[PDB]
Amino acid sequence: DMYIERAGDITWEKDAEVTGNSPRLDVALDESGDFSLVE
C-alpha cells in the first residue's frame, strides 16, 4: 500500500534559485508514454 504525506503549499517564491538552460529538442512519444530523441 502506497501512502501520501503533505510537503508544502503551491506558491511562487520571489528570489528562488534560478538555474537550468532552454533546449529545443526533436522527440517522439511511443504508445507506452516514453519520449525518445528523434535525430
Binding site: 501520501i4 510537503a7 503549499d9 506558491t11 538555474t19 529538442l25
Partner: protein, 156 residues
C-alpha cells in the same frame, strides 16, 4: 484522510524502509500524479483511501477521487518554477525558462533540471501560482543529463 490543497510525497514500505516513489498535487479534493509513480494503484491518506478515477499511460497522468482539475498552460514566454520535492529533502522552488519538445503532434514546454526519479510528479507553476503541469516524463540528452516535459492534462 488529509484533503488540504498543496503538494504531497508518494511513499511505499514494500521495499527497505519508507521509500519515496514520487510526488503529486491535491486540488479541489482531487489528487494528481504521474502514472509511472503509482501504476494506477490505490493510495492511503492516514485512515482514508484514494481510488484512481482517470488514467492514461500515454499522457503518463492519473487522478484520484475526481476528474483532472489542472488546466493552466505555459504561455511560451515567461520563466516558471519547478516546486521540486526530492526524497528525504524539503520542498524547494527552482526557477527556470523552459525549452521545447518538438513532436509530430505539436510543441511542448520542457524544463532542463536533473533530480532523482522519486521527484517525478513535482508541479511546475506560472507567476500566479497555478500548476501548468508535472515533472518526471522526458529524455536523457547527449551530455547524460535529464530533460523533462511540462506534462498537463485536459479538464472537462
Amino acid at each position: 484522510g488529509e484533503t488540504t490543497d498543496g503538494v504531497y510525497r508518494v511513499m511505499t514500505r514494500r521495499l527497505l524502509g519508507s521509500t519515496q516513489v514520487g510526488v503529486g498535487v491535491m486540488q479541489e479534493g482531487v489528487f494528481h500524479t504521474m502514472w509511472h509513480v503509482t501504476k494506477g494503484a490505490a493510495l492511503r491518506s492516514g485512515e482514508g483511501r484514494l481510488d484512481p478515477y482517470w488514467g492514461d499511460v500515454k499522457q503518463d497522468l492519473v487522478s484520484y477521487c475526481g476528474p483532472w482539475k489542472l488546466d493552466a498552460a505555459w504561455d511560451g514566454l515567461s520563466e516558471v518554477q519547478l516546486l521540486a520535492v526530492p526524497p528525504g529533502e524539503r520542498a524547494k522552488n527552482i526557477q527556470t525558462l523552459p525549452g521545447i519538445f518538438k513532436t509530430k503532434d505539436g510543441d511542448i514546454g520542457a524544463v532542463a533540471l536533473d533530480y532523482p526519479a522519486g521527484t517525478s510528479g513535482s508541479p511546475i507553476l506560472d507567476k500566479c501560482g497555478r500548476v501548468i503541469g508535472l515533472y518526471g516524463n522526458g529524455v536523457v540528452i547527449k551530455n547524460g543529463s535529464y530533460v523533462s516535459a511540462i506534462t498537463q492534462g485536459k479538464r472537462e
